[PDB]
Symmetry: D2
Subunit: 250 residues, 4 copies
């Protein structure tokens, strides 16, 4: 049997690069998506063509609500249903937008999305992963800039901080079960869709190492390392993949 992995928000961008690279390493993959139905199915088709029966999709809103636990349970369940095991969880899915403290989503909704996807869903997915339980491991996508945050991004920042706390707490608690829990913290990687090219180059020029953003593959590379046999004593660790960005003063 090949080991199996769940990757959240795996339809596009970094999650996709992680799913692809896990697959290329021998994993069967559950491709979680929320809205990117077409891109999801397209990836699974591409992976299944490469080796049949090695990729499924699973749809779920990771917004906080009273039913998020059941949705997270379902994501993990889908991996056992498809593949009879679940060896790796990658908590990649993420909402990211400004929530200024000083003044068309309600604040209730902003909290639900930013805290639910970035922190609560990871926690619930971790809980379901552990409960349904080898080289078992969880990788959380954190954020190298969490201590030098973007202005007006307090809820996102709060969620990413909470994710660091989850990384530590679950590493401690799940170690006796042989499950390792680690983090990968991008600096600037795949830049947003609705962002101009002056503004892209603004960000690029701040990166000491090469004056450019991370490829999604460069982020995936770190994920690969942490799940691998080369990381069997690593737990509770967060690896920044930021080209020095977090070292740069204002």
């Amino acid at each position: 049997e090949a080991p199996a992995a769940v990757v959240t928000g795996a339809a596009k961008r970094i999650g996709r690069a992680i799913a692809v690279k896990l697959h290329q390493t021998g994993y069967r993959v559950v491709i979680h998506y929320h809205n990117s139905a077409e891109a999801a199915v397209s990836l699974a088709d591409e992976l299944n063509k490469e080796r049949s029966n090695t990729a499924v999709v699973c749809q779920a809103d990771l917004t906080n609500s009273n039913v998020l636990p059941a949705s997270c349970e379902e994501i993990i369940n889908s991996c056992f249903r498809a593949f009879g095991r679940c060896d790796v969880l990658v908590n990649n899915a993420s909402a990211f937008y400004p929530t200024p403290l000083v003044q068309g989503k309600t604040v209730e909704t902003q909290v639900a999305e930013l805290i639910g996807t970035n922190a609560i869903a990871p926690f619930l997915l971790t809980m379901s992963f552990a409960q349904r339980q080898s080289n078992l491991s969880i990788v959380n996508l954190c954020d190298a800039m969490v201590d030098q945050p973007c202005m007006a991004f307090s809820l996102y920042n709060m969620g990413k901080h909470a994710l660091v706390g989850l990384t530590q707490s679950a590493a401690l608690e799940l170690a006796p079960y042989g499950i390792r829990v680690n983090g990968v913290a991008p600096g600037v990687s795949l830049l947003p869709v609705a962002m101009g090219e002056e503004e892209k180059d603004k960000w690029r020029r701040k990166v000491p190492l090469g004056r450019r953003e991370a490829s999604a593959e460069q982020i995936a590379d770190a994920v690969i390392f942490l799940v691998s046999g080369s990381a069997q004593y690593i737990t509770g660790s967060i690896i920044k993949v930021d080209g020095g960005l977090s070292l740069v003063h204002a």
Copy 2:
């Protein structure tokens, strides 16, 4: 006119000590509470006996829900209606219990993330929007990177509060509102905890082998709101007697 302060969970223990010290410092105080009505009123009466019309109480549940934003807006409002201004917010209220990975889970999330993180954020928003030496102090936790076993949601909330501290410091600094934290290690231990178990914690503290008094925590809060902290924002002061420096 005397400045005013809101202290959440102010009825008992650390928040009580904070409210009293701010009062003794010359502040008028909103004593926020959840269940502890009798304790909150009795504190208010004592402070008002010391100085007339300087203390009011305000009831609210800080658990995460669709109505928490309204609740927090009202807390801040209560300070303005009582005293005509709101100079200081102390985010002290906290839920703290284990949530093992292996009450419903939704309730646990709502209580531990709502009280520890989301309500502070909502209160911070309301405080800033309704605007001197304005400042916010959040009660953090010195042991957040060396957490208690099976306290993941608690720890996530306290980490989130560190993020809020930093993020709000950055964003509110142009308005002249400072935002800082106080991170106790072991302070007031549960009353009902056995002395032999309290002693296990006490013995771990390098500095004097005892827990912090509530007054010692309040002392750091007083500093951060004071004119001696006018350039300090986005700082978290550990008040932990060296406990976080101690290896396993």
Copy 3:
């Protein structure tokens, strides 16, 4: 009687502001200086005119060498000789200059000054202070809020300030059983270099979120005063940033 404090590099700038504030709080002070003799004696004079017999000077190079331990021992001894006690040590003295990796002091000299003043002398003074102990004893170390986002080409300075964090933690742990607290104060941008030009100063000022200005020497001293006070009696191993939010600002 009145408590006594040693403040290193106290002739000018932040060290002076710390000595002054400790003095105004009722402390007797040793003003340590290296080169700034005129300025040291002037300050002691001012303080002595305010209350007599309350300020002494003490000269010492804090560059690392085989005699640095003796020099640090002597600084501490100066306090016991003048005032009969030593309650507070402020490690303020600091060398600060670029040491580029890829490149007229020798490298030997750079290491001795930047690592000596910023880390080894604090460690030796800490040892001497604690050993001489026979109340509210504490040590405050002047750290740097920007140690994790350092200036380009300042590796030795940054290494010494990182060592000083390590000293702060290690000494807080070890000395707590003796009742000695050890904490730090970490400025961001405070008094800018005397040599720096106004346009350069203003570039730095505009980076500070809280007020777009540097900390005053007094504002730094305020935090020192808090940590030595009875208001900080349970605080040890803490480093308080006094930086106006500067360390939170991304590139």
Copy 4:
């Protein structure tokens, strides 16, 4: 031809594991040593037998003296001499012993600050000066924020090494030289009952890290899979640093 690595203190324990793994990965390697000539040569023998003329040794004392600079220049040199290039520097060599606040102190400084911090800084300068996937890996310590009682100078030096890692990453990024750290917890350990005490504290498997586990992290950091990673310190501690008092 094939890339070349320097590993300091590579004769035994953690440094040897790093040396072997880099060799296995296809690096030509300099095995630096202070005292352990026998061990160094023996390792050299083993690696040359697998692949001819791909491992040399280098003597240098890394204590803090007026000659440390020259020593560190020599070490980097010997890599360019043997192999005509130097792709990777692993700063592994390290001293470790208590220095209570309550050997002359300056030997202590020269060892604990000298070997642990100043020589890395000097080797970094020489490595950089003489310049691809170039990078430097510094052996840090995961327990730096919760230090052993009475280990102030040691702790100070390891904190200084974090400072160097960050400052050098920033400064050398323009030249395509990455600079990173690996922070072991309890690895190869002292009595046997004392050692057991430590093992039981570790969340992940109640045992010390093998030297090879440390070396694995180094390998990752030098590899093409880490081409965007600089200024990062990877803990390899089995979760020990997460455990409270």
